[PDB]
Symmetry: C2
């Protein structure tokens, strides 16, 4: 569908935010603010891969990967996948799977011994089909 | 108690690795290897707080914090708590609570709207008593 899978770019920022609005609260932010947040995230070693409708530049898929170096397991890192979102119109098109697989490969290439992510009840089957298995439980505290 | 709560430092690394042995697989690493990992972790913006028996410098408690900015919710960050471990000998000292609360305060200071972590079934009660609530499920893929 004229889709490209690539790292996030500055010009993507506004469209990317709209996309994320399908996941959680996504109040409007200025270009400068979004760019500053992107820089913050990059410093934290986060990578964001997106599916872009190349002809128009519209962002229709996103997934972020955070690699965490560890002292344990002989110093092998852990890949944290988060904020996996796909445009409603493209659900069942395989974008989600492609994003996850891509991030898993990146993790593997960087010495990670495992990739972890948090899933809702509804998404369990999706992740299990990709080889993921339910393990620990996410605990949350709101500040 | 003779204990002090402070940030992890290079002189702690070896004793720290020994402590982590109580949480998961932690094969031996050289001082050079440990130092490099600690470097990589700081580069990722990871903060590690430890309890230290000052007289001997033995590390008896540890908890790490990764603050990740998001594009959503107006750019408010999420506090990711990782690798919480307390020496069994201090099972009655309440170090776990102190460590978690400390990281939550740091998270608060950085504008985090929530703090999340992955808990084993065995640690569930500990976290729920601290005010954390069971949320989404952790999915894991071994590489």
């Amino acid at each position: 569908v004229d889709l490209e899978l690539r790292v996030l770019e500055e010009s993507d920022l506004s469209s990317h935010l709209e996309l994320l609005g399908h996941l959680t609260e996504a109040p409007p932010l200025s270009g400068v603010e979004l760019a500053n947040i992107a820089d913050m995230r990059r410093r934290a070693g986060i990578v964001t891969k997106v599916f872009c409708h190349q002809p128009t530049g519209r962002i229709v898929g996103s997934a972020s990967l955070m690699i965490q170096p560890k002292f344990t397991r002989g110093g092998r890192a852990v890949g944290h996948i988060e904020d996996v979102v796909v445009d409603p119109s493209y659900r069942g098109a395989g974008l989600g799977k492609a994003l996850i697989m891509d991030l898993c490969e990146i993790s593997r290439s960087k010495g990670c011994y495992k990739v972890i992510l948090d899933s809702s009840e509804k998404s369990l089957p999706f992740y299990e089909k990709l080889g993921f298995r339910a393990h620990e439980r996410q605990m949350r505290l709101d500040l």
